[PDB]
Amino acid sequence: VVHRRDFPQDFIFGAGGSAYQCEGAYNEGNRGPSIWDTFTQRSPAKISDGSNGNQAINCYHMYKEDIKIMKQTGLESYRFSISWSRVLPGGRLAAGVNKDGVKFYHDFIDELLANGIKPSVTLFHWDLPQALEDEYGGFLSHRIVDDFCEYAEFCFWEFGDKIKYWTTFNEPHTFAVNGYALGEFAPGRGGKGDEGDPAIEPYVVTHNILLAHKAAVEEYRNKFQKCQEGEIGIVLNSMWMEPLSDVQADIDAQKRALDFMLGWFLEPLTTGDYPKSMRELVKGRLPKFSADDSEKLKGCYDFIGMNYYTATYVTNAVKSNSEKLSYETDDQVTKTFERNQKPIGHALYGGWQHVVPWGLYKLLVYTKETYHVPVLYVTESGMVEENKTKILLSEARRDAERTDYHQKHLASVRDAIDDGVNVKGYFVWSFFDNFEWNLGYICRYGIIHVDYKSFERYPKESAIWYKNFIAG
Amino acid sequence: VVHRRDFPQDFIFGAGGSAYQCEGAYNEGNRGPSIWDTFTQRSPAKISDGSNGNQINCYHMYKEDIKIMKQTGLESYRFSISWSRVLPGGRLAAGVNKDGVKFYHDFIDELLANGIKPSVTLFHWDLPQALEDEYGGFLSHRIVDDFCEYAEFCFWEFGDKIKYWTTFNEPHTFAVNGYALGEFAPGRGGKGDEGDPAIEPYVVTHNILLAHKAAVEEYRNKFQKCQEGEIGIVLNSMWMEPLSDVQADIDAQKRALDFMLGWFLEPLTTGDYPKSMRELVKGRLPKFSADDSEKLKGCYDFIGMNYYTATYVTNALSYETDDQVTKTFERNQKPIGHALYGGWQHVVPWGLYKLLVYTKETYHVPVLYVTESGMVEENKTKILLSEARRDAERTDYHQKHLASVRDAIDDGVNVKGYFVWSFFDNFEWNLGYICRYGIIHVDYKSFERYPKESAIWYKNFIAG
Amino acid sequence: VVHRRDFPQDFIFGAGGSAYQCEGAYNEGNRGPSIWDTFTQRSPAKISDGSNGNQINCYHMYKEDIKIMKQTGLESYRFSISWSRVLPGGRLAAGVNKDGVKFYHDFIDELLANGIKPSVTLFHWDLPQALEDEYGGFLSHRIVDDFCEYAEFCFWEFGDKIKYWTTFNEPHTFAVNGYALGEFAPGRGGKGDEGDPAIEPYVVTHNILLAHKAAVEEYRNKFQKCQEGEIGIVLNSMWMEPLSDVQADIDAQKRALDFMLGWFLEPLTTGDYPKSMRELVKGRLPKFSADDSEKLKGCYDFIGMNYYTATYVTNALSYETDDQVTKTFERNQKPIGHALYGGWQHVVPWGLYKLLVYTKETYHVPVLYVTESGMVEENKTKILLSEARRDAERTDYHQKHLASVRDAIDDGVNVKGYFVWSFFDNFEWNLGYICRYGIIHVDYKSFERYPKESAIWYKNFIAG
Ligand SMILES: CC[C@H]1[C@H](O[C@@H]2O[C@H](CO)[C@@H](O)[C@H](O)[C@H]2O)OC=C(C(=O)OC)[C@H]1C[C@@H]1NCCc2c1[nH]c1ccccc21
Ligand SMILES: CC[C@H]1[C@H](O[C@@H]2O[C@H](CO)[C@@H](O)[C@H](O)[C@H]2O)OC=C(C(=O)OC)[C@H]1C[C@@H]1NCCc2c1[nH]c1ccccc21
């Protein structure tokens, strides 16, 4: 029960992918290694099944086909990302610009347009050129901000004549928390036995991300927006934080959990400063913005993309022995999916995603309430699914649960727009089944089935549902 | 401690693969499905990791593979024609697929272009689906006659350039796991499955022998004179070591052997199945007509022999049970030999010795070759290529094994060939890709190919 | 006055190039950046004319180049594999780049297709960036083990067709200008630079020797038997002539030599560095474990030797200063020999003689080859090709030089090879393209290729 009609005339329906997870051909067409190759190649034991995005799902060879599948599905827009290191193999500009790479993107762009599909480019989705990570520590250094400027500029210039929707960072919260705190994702530092420092690094990284985002955005506003007629934003994520009980401790915990995952970023792009909740708890470990930075950061995005998966009960926690100072612990908030052994929502394959359609509602509404953002897009939305091998294609593709999941989720999204909040886009994650980072290929997210061996692609029932729904 | 020199001037050193396990491209170049596609597609829960021979892609990458062969220094490589790629529909009305017969010619010519001897197994379990379907495959005497046409087409098509032909690879396995255990294409007989494990295996091998016979006669009578080649059949057995020195155990080794090897050799010697089988299977073991018996006697040019391991044996309605012989790898909880990844393969270099010697003693065979020999290896994901390839244990494995093969030659038995199984890592049938057998590593995803230490060792050794 | 005949029947006449200086196409065919790209891109103010090895384009134009080689009559050509083109990411997890290994195979096959002997240096300073980056490159014992894998891949990949292997070209230079002078990739140690000129060079060459050792053992043990080739290492020195006949000057030549050549040879002889070095560098000169010392003794199949010039030498915290020996080209303001374009190269044909003789006398080496020999030439722009190519002085240069090499053979020393540096004019490292070394002129812009008189001379001379 929910149709195209209940959504604005101009609302955009879409799905996504991302270089590393899709393109494959890591070592073809002159592409320079990203930290994600290196992670997955030097540290394969940190991948659930030991795999890597070397071939991924081979979107780099098969684009013409994929865009076929897109149009069959009726996507209004697809969201993909440029592998930084495929346009600039060595990271900076001295290393040179790789012509094979820029052909691909152009070919790809032109193909989407040739099929009536709106291109939407994330600049950075964690596939940071190894070259840079290596030289100066990547985002551990303010050197990155400047190189990201060049990268951003090059792209806008090279391709921007034809894409009107730019994204700087995809889920920088994740990138830095999983990267420099959990040690679970490229470059894999901070976690135990790992090389970093989980008390310091995350905060440095995100500090620089915001500083890069800022330079990226300014570049575009001042030198390109006037002509290309486009919009840059940044897409962030959060779980919804539901107070476990109606006590103050929980109520406040929600604020800290929210601030520390979302505010961490939004607040700067709002006030010019980090959540006080964080300043309060993180103290000297949380870097300061120059007086100018603060101002230039205020309202410095054209839109916020928003990725939602799940919601957790939240509560203030007490430990304090074998606490190591770490970002993990700093938001003194214990999460749990259980109220009174009752889960918050049905528990999907991972053990982490729980279907909570209504968390998306609460979160969006929250983001208006607290961050008064002009333009909002649900940029990632979707359900995980175990990759059962030993079942026929005939079966795997009857993903009713996934149809349902997007129905319910769209229902909340409608309910958010209806109550004021200015959502303008739903983006199914993921268009195709792809490489699920540290989980490799043990699961699937897409509305188009992909055989991780043959690369063959068959549409799930969800895709079909969606084809009909996009067409009201 | 073992060198090239310890072996006859003429002894051949080689390695192998097998259509289904290698070629991939199941549905390209107009190939017709085999039972092994079907098995693996319709029944993928019977595969350890659910996978299939659909794609290690030797079908596209042959020119490269032959390079690697020649680097390794192989004197000969042993491959197999997918029956169903030259005759998509099984019989001759279905037609001859030109794309397929180009491949094999391209491939054979490539081998010879590089100094490598081609050696063609005709059947390695990828029977065309079309045939399995139409008349039950090897459960029908219809197969014998079509196998003859296949055989004949081939020899005619390619034989002007290959001098080593094999009819069946491991028919014992084919029939026992196929129609008894239900574990391999077409997957009948086993629990919940469709066949009958008391009947089918016997009918099946009874026809295979009848097929092999027709294949061989075709060859001797119409092709041997010209192509000056040699047809044989490759069989396999575990060595059977009596658990203790009592007669019950001694007689059990007789039964165990008869039931696994004699099942085939004895016909190809006396023209009749092992008395041990006749006595136990009685009426469920089909009879050979008077004529069949004679034409079957000494009806091979050589026996190939596949060895992997040996089991202690002792005294204990289906074929599994019919050789009333309990198998076990433990003496006094002592293993017979070191236990390789599977739980099944144990390194028993001296079982090859014992077995070869046995085959001379019992079946007086003119020419023998060790056509499959090699060690399994766990497909550990989560380790660097740098490591995976330091297969010390596999070098050792082949050393020890060649050590026993020398010893066999030295004591009369006429082995003329060692053949590493398998040249490349490939699709390990019902275990899919959770293990590896090869001297050349293969990335099951990228198809990329890097040589193991073992292959390097072998490169040196071939070169004495 | 000097002909072919004055030289052994078996003596090889050749010329050379070097990946970075020739191939160009730094970013095509999937090659991974070396430190020398990086150096030249991030640090182009350290290059005389600011240029880089990005593009003399031998990578596209090989077939042509091999023609020119064969016109010239070269018996063998000496090139180098860009480590970073077969292994883009340095180690094996980064993967093997097929495009690259096609090139070298295409290239090797081309040489042999034309009657020219292939001769592969493994390392000529284009270390993969990925490695330099990850663990400091040669400042870490990590390099030894990866160099082994590189070495091994190669021999395996191509070795079935090349019979002359070299581990390192001029490691002395690599380490001294690299980590002492800061003048060559990665450019550390020198004034304002990042290294330490008292420590690094010693650690670096200490590892190079450790690498060379591992490379060589790999070869002897696993490949020599088959490919029947030979691995060595190419070193270099100036000849050191005492300024006067006092002992201070005599002892200085000992130090000068030890510190430049002994630094390497002595380990590859006794298993230890020159006592002269041990005495002066003390604790900053790392020690070889008991095992390393033995496995290092006589650990080469031949020494290649690069000669350019000779310096008068005399008595005088960084390696430059540690051999307390002031160098000078002037006796009594008389130059040691005619002063070539740079200010550094002086024509001293007889220094090659002296040096070769010295190396026999001091390091008793089985086989020696003159692997690099040639004269620099100013890249005068503003003159016609007609003129540039009348390199009389370069003909003369090689004559005189071969004259001394003959004389060396004649007095016992076992030289087996003269190799003109450089076949083609190419990228002269930190001097970029402001000079030329070759017997084949190359238009640094158009890549066009016309042979100098020198090349013609050499064509005749090779042909006695
Ligand atoms: C079906 C393969 C049989 C195998 O046939 C050859 O095996 C190669 C690899 O095993 C294969 O590539 C080639 O095609 C064959 O010629 O050999 C014999 C078997 C057998 O059961 O007893 C003799 C079979 C294997 C044996 N079966 C019982 C348990 C088991 C076997 N092999 C492994 C390996 C790892 C774990 C368990 C096992
Ligand atoms: C770095 C090159 C060294 C060179 O190494 C070979 O040189 C070839 C050309 O010189 C080159 O193509 C090949 O790669 C090398 O095997 O030889 C030795 C040097 C040295 O400093 O003392 C021995 C080096 C050169 C020497 N360095 C000090 C000053 C100088 C040198 N060569 C010239 C040439 C012109 C002006 C100055 C100089």
Swiss-Prot record, chains B, C:
The free-text biotechnology note states: Ajmaline is an anti-arrhythmic alkaloid commercially used as an efficient drug for the treatment of arrhythmic heart disorder.
The annotated consequence of W344A reads: Loss of activity and reduced affinity
User: Which residues, by range, are in coiled-coil regions?
Assistant: none
What reaction does this catalyse?
A: 3alpha(S)-strictosidine + H2O = strictosidine aglycone + D-glucose
For the ligand (a beta-D-glucoside), the binding residues are Q21, H124, N169, E170, Y308, E372, W421, E428, W429, Y437
A single Gene Ontology biological process assigned to it is: alkaloid biosynthetic process
InterPro entries xrefs: Glyco_hydro_1, Glyco_hydro_1_N_CS, Glycoside_hydrolase_SF
Expressing tissues: Mainly expressed, at low levels, in roots and, to a lower level, in leaves.
Effect listed in the UniProt record for changing E170 to D/Q: Loss of activity
> EC annotation?
3.2.1.105
Q: Which residues form the active site?
A: E170 (proton donor), E372 (nucleophile)
What are the protein's GO molecular function terms?
strictosidine beta-glucosidase activity
**Chain's role:** Glucosidase specifically involved in alkaloid biosynthesis leading to the accumulation of several alkaloids, including ajmaline, an important plant-derived pharmaceutical used in the therapy of heart disorders.
Family under the similarity heading: Belongs to the glycosyl hydrolase 1 family.
For this protein, the record's PANTHER family field holds: GLYCOSYL HYDROLASE, MYROSINASE 3-RELATED
| Name of the protein this chain belongs to | Strictosidine-O-beta-D-glucosidase
